[model samples]
Target: SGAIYVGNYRVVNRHLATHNDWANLVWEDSSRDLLVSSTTAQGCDTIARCDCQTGVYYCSSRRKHYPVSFSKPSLIFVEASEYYPARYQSHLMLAVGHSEPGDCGGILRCQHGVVGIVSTGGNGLVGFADVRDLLWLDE
Candidate 1:
């Protein structure tokens, strides 16, 4: 396991596999680009393996030491407060959840379909790049 304090959020990760609740988390994977054929969540169920949680701190990490309820974890899709290299789309995006620098490459999706790639991350969140438009190359 690992930990990071990025702002008000305390992030962490683990490989125990048994400590997390899979139902409450989502991840963006790039190696397996599951073509989103529809505008809705039709064939996207497998997009998220549902194998692991947010790869961050669990409800009982500090929750047990610090004390809290066992509620479903949170997956946050955040916007960048600032951006960079707007010309070539070096824009920044923020994903609010429990994660460290390792989760930076996490990809993101939505009803709009696969949106972009997680550029970099730390302090419990990640920076992203919107690569969706670049995909208009095909159907």
Candidate 2:
């Protein structure tokens, strides 16, 4: 388990598997790219893998922590505020632990004109949103 203070949020990572309740916690470094799929159209963001039984998560480049379930451990993208300006840039993606039962599953909710990526199960909280996809500013 490791934790760092990022502004008002206490960014935490549990190598042993645990769910964090912070509203704004960004793990994993965006500068690093996923090595497995370098040429995909979606591009290679931060890819993550989790061990359901052991509740451990592994990411390419650098290993970071996320909030998820140990039973159905999985990977999903959370917000990275450093890439803000909602209309022009996208947030950083993090691979966090999940308790959901589907692949690429996580919370996708909107609030206060901002979209968030929360957990699929339990009390879904914490996530990211950008106007690029919603408003189609790129197009």
Candidate 3:
């Protein structure tokens, strides 16, 4: 949908088309895509989104041209990295190995439902998103 889901305990808002609202939708979509790609050996046919607010009920859709698959069996969660402090000598990483390879080298720790943010510049840390959403893909 043109708008996004914002109710039901979620902090997102879809009443206005503000910059942050769009950004949140983009990031949320990206996060969902990442989860789908990582968990599925073969990708899905399409993804659907729906929105409801104000005078208009918005909706949008997209499709994939070709099927996509991964090398490993499957994994969940988003794996991302951000720049760390120079003193640490490395950038922070997120969701490194919940169901895959690469460890934190004893430099970082993992937690669930904890919101943490890393920076692009020095003096940052690594983390992962909570695995709240689950998807099943053809394997």
Best by lDDT: 1
Ranking by lDDT: 1, 2, 3
For candidate 1, give the lDDT of residue 129.
43
Cα error, candidate 2, residue 134 (Å):
4.1
Clash pairs, candidate 1, are 6-123, 28-107, 63-67
Comparison by lDDT, 1 against 3, better one: 1
Residue 34 accuracy (lDDT) in model 1: 14
Looking at candidate 3, what is the lDDT of residue 124?
Answer: 27
Model 2, span 1-139: residue lDDT tens: 2222212333222111233332222333222211011111332121122222222222111334343332222234333333322222123232333333221112222222112232222223322221112222111
Clashing pairs in 2: 68-97, 69-98, 117-127
lDDT of 3 by residue, 94-122 (tens): 32222111211111112221121111112
- For candidate 2, the TM-score is 0.18
List model 1 lDDT by residue over 8-118, tens digit each: 222222121123312322332222211121121222211222212222222222332111111122233333423222222233444464444344334444433333334
Q: What is the lDDT of residue 56 in candidate 1?
A: 26
Instruction: Give the winner by lDDT: 2 or 3.
Output: 2
- Tell me how many clashing residue pairs each candidate has: 3, 3, 3
User: By the TM-score metric, which is better: model 1 or model 2?
Assistant: 1
